[PDB]
Amino acid sequence: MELTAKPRTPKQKLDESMIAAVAYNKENNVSFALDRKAFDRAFRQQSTTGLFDITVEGGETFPALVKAVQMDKRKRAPIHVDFYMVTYGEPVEVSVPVHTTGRSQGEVQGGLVDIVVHNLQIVAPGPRRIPQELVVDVTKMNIGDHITAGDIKLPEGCTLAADPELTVVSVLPPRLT
Amino acid sequence: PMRRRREARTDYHQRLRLLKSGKPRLVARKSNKHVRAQLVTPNGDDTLASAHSSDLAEYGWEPTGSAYLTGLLAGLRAQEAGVEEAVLDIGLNSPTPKVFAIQEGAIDAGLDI
Amino acid sequence: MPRLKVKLVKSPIGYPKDQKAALKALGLRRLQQERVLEDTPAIRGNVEKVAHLVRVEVVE
Amino acid sequence: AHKKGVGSSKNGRDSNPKYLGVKKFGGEVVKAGNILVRQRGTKFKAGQGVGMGRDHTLFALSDGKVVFINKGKGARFISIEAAQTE
């Protein structure tokens, strides 16, 4: 929301209350603006997972938002971001995630639990059409048991920008199995 | 590797072999069907159609003669041009009796070879 | 042909060799005096490099 | 009457290769470029190599000496403009 500025002036903006991010959208890029404050609040809600936008000069209050950053530096305090928009019926670069709930099988009985190298998914279902929250958990958890890509179980928007057999989640001995 | 190297058959390089110098890649280029020869002489040179089995209709003398004459010929259109001694470029093959042929071509041509 | 006038400050004493060279170069003798040169980069360079070495003012 | 072990302790010694003349300088049928001795010089300049591009040294006379596979066995001539009728 809001986020402004766009001349050419880093060092100082990179100082105070306005961290700098690039205005990026296939074909065009204009001088960063926006401000570490806003960032805070919303990236807060969910950078590269939810998705809103700004109203600069009403401009083209379109979505996408960030497709590159790093809360960078040492302090763990970000500066210099990458914003991109998609008013197009092409949205493919889609990274939102999926969850479970804690299906009592390995855990609530065997202590046993899981490794979720996954969590997040980068694919491309229906453009400007992705659940701000995708849930997927056929439960199942214990012994030397493991699950991934393939099996997965995908809803509507049929993409899968990724690949079969890989990093979903598995059960491992929290102590033993 | 390198383009030509992952490929093969070639030795365009012994081509270079001559590239060093000696005047012109009087290069015999062959595809049974016919043969056609050109002249690549160092300095990002060029050529001058000196010999081809089509610049004067693909007779019906087949190899032997065919090469004999087209050669002699090239040699001459060439001297017309104004060269002197040229240098043999086995476009490919082990100077096959065919090449042999084009070769005396320059030979008799006068085309020093 | 902007005409640059520079005045000498914070002594070479120790400060780098070549640098000392930008000094005799520009033409730089005793202390805290001032000299002048056409914008001409070459000139311009020797001096801005030694930078701090003194003060650079715009006139003719 | 002998030497020992478990004491690596072994300096090494000198050499002195180079890009002697460097590209585009008063050319003079002389040790062209070097990083490989028993060289077999070549024509004017070189530019083939395990990186791509190519080198032009605006100076020519008979020829120079190379570096076995480093640098570049010149051959793609360049006698340079300063080689026209006096």
Add this chain to the structure above:
Amino acid sequence: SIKPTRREYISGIPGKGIAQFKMGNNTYPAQVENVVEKPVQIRHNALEAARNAANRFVQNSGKFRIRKFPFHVIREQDGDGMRAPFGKSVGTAARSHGANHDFIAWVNPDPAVEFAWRRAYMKVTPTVNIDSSPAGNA
């Protein structure tokens, strides 16, 4: 920042004998964690300990993933006196690069663990920073 001889020549290519990388558990959201900001050839053993220490205080869920590893080595005393130094080796460590992603306590809601790492923390050797990752912790 002096370092080892040749990793196949002084002392090079081990197993830095230690105590592996993952204990703790899963989850999709809450990043609960440990990172530091000092600079040092992190003390093999030391570390190893510290770490398994945490393990010790806990036992299960709460990603005790630990992002560190000692891979080069120190040396001193073994031969004639003080002048000409042959070379006794000890001290396998790693360059804690003045702050960075150390070891995590990752999970939905298990503060039991958080505290635990804490423990592991007080533990460790060079002050280290106690923290949260991309969202907070829950």
Add this chain to the structure above:
Amino acid sequence: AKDGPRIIVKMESSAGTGFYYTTTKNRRNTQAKLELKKYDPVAKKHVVFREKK
């Protein structure tokens, strides 16, 4: 040089007597008595050179 009764013995050759000789090092290694190659005595030019010595 370093007289080594090791498979390394110095030897030279003659031009049928083109007159003198020229410089070679050799190995019993293989082929014993064997030793023929051609050269150029101050004598004229070329000539058959036997190497044994």
Add this chain to the structure above:
Amino acid sequence: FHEMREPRIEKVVVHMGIGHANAEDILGEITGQMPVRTKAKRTVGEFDIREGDPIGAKVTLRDEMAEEFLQTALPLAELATSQFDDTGNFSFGLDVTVNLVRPGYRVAKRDKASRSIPTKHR
């Protein structure tokens, strides 16, 4: 274009190779395309250590001459199943291996654009 897929003789190989001198002569009489190919290893499973010995014999026969053989000898053989294998090729007897040749085949020898032989044509 059935005028494709449907085959045409491309490589038949007949041989043998004891760790060992003329048996290959027997070969010779049998055919007409010699095959002096050194064999290897370094151990005693047959007293085969001499790591470097002429001992592998292989009478290559594609098409033509291979026809003389497919004929003359195909009779003495007796299985006709199993010893059939995958890449469209098979083998049997005291050292025999043949290779079918669907039309994609040849692409495979090219130093250039060597299409990794689509397991759909072969």
Add this chain to the structure above:
RNA sequence: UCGCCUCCUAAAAGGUAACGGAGGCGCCCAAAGGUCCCCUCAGGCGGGACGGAAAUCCGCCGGAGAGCGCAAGGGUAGAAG
């Protein structure tokens, strides 16, 4: 421990100690020499003899990772091979 060959160290030309790092040499090869003629590796995969590591042959895949007497580094199949 004292001479020489390679590597790092040299902070990006070239070049520096150190009782700093590791490691090779005081040979050879009459043919690894000259040149002309031809060959295109290891390795993986699949299929068969004496063969169940580890060949032999055949059919694919291949910035060459094999290879070069001997050590390292350079190279580089267009080949030194």
Add this chain to the structure above:
RNA sequence: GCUGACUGGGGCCUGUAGAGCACUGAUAGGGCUAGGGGGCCCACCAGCCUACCAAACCCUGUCAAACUCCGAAGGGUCCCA
């Protein structure tokens, strides 16, 4: 006797710091897998399953002066000033 350190320009070299992984050697969570297991028909069975060790290839991840597909900071040199 304007030829010199230096500064402006323009070629043309190095290839530490950085950074990275496909060259190499590390290396950690991990998955595919087959080598050892290991429990089951007792078991030449080479048939079975599976919770410990692994090679190898994969995804997530890391380090290197004698690793680098990457690439500055800068220094070099000829010339034009």
Add this chain to the structure above:
RNA sequence: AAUCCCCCGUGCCCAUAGCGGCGUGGAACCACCCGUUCCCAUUCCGAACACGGAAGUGAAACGCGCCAGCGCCGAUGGUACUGGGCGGGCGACCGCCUGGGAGAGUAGGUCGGUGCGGGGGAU
């Protein structure tokens, strides 16, 4: 004759040309082809190299065209490193001021472009 299609030899540009997936072409082209006394030639057959010729064929190597899967390339702004200049910690080290400013990281890009000639094809 010295205008464009096209194929053919073929040259510069060291993958924005490689992979592979479908496809198209033979009159013209080219290859594949046919056959093997003689040239020359396989450590073994002229499979490759070969000499001599239709018919057969576009299958195969091949040329443009479509496809982003791999692959290659690759910016903006952007961080580390730093030339230089000055400040803060006994500290390993922290910071600032002034030109330089890689890779990797999403756009996104490409499936050549271009030399000369020879054959045609456009009265």
